[PDB]
């Protein structure tokens, strides 16, 4: 039940294309107070922070508890696992008992050619 649903689980693209990843906090009494994205390079285990800037656009709709990442002009070196993180930090909606964060299961991205 209470989870961050991340779509798609996997995509293949050609380089020069772009890709959107969508996360929603489902079955939660908690508000979406803040969001963060990370990238694991194919073959690495270190999670790299991704900022809003350059080829990365990060959006949030707090009311529907959704957030997205759009990557513009995909490269082969963009191939890897993308994670989204949802923060609930006010913990003052009546039935919301936690402060902290939960992530989706990730998106495995394959960029070709």
């Amino acid at each position: 039940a209470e989870r961050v649903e991340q779509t798609p689980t996997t995509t293949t693209k050609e380089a020069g294309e772009s890709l959107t990843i969508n996360c929603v906090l489902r079955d939660s009494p908690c508000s979406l107070d803040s969001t963060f994205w990370y990238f694991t390079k194919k073959g690495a285990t270190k999670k790299e922070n991704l900022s809003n800037g350059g080829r990365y656009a990060e959006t949030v709709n707090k009311a529907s508890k959704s957030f997205s990442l759009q990557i513009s002009d995909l490269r082969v070196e963009d191939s890897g696992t993308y994670h989204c993180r949802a923060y609930s930090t006010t913990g003052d909606e009546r039935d919301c008992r936690w402060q902290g964060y939960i992530e989706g299961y990730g998106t495995i991205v394959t960029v070709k050619s």
Binding site: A1, Y38, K46, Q99, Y105
Partner: protein
């Protein structure tokens, strides 16, 4: 001189959830903020305290509990939850004060043949009490007919292996979990964040 959280978070092998491990932490300083800010965790959920306040607080005792479950069970490590993990394996009390921390450990804990070393309890006659531990392996009598310590019709070995394989869906992959309980008892408070 700093708390040995390293011994818990980075242990080579974790416990099965039914045989969950506990380290009693005392007489030390702990930078909770470097844990909370680390990119390595996928769950960091604090009940009855804010994660960004922990560096500022002191406690009598911190318990660091640790085990492996599958990713889609991580939500059952919370006060007031139901399901086979919360009911039969590891139960938190309603008034829990602590953080639940989890990360994907597919790279450490899954094996090509299946890792048979991580189990969970699938059957029990009653729900665990908060922080109770059951490591018994008696055949579970599901029906009216007596088992006499023999697996059989409605007579089940009570532990199931996760059998983690690296090719499983991420909901079926192994997650390492650490639960930090912050205990405040009549004693004076030896376990501090740096800023306290």
């Amino acid at each position: 001189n700093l708390c040995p959280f390293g011994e818990v978070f980075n242990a080579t092998r974790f416990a099965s959830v039914y045989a969950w491990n506990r380290k009693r932490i005392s007489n030390c300083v702990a930078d909770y903020s470097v844990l909370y800010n680390s990119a390595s965790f996928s769950t960091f959920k604090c009940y009855g305290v804010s994660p960004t306040k922990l560096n500022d607080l002191c406690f009598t005792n911190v318990y660091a509990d640790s085990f492996v479950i599958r990713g889609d069970e991580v939500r059952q490590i919370a006060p007031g939850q139901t399901g086979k993990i919360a009911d039969y394996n590891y139960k938190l009390p309603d008034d829990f004060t602590g953080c639940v921390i989890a990360w994907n450990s597919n790279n450490l804990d899954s094996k090509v043949g299946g890792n048979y070393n991580y189990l969970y309890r699938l059957f029990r006659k009653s729900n665990l009490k908060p922080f109770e531990r059951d490591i018994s392996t008696e055949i579970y009598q599901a029906g009216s007919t007596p088992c006499n310590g023999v697996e059989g019709f409605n007579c089940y070995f009570p532990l199931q292996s996760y059998g983690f394989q690296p090719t499983y869906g991420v909901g079926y992959q192994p997650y390492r979990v650490v639960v930090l309980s912050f205990e405040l008892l009549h004693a004076p408070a030896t376990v501090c964040g740096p800023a306290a």
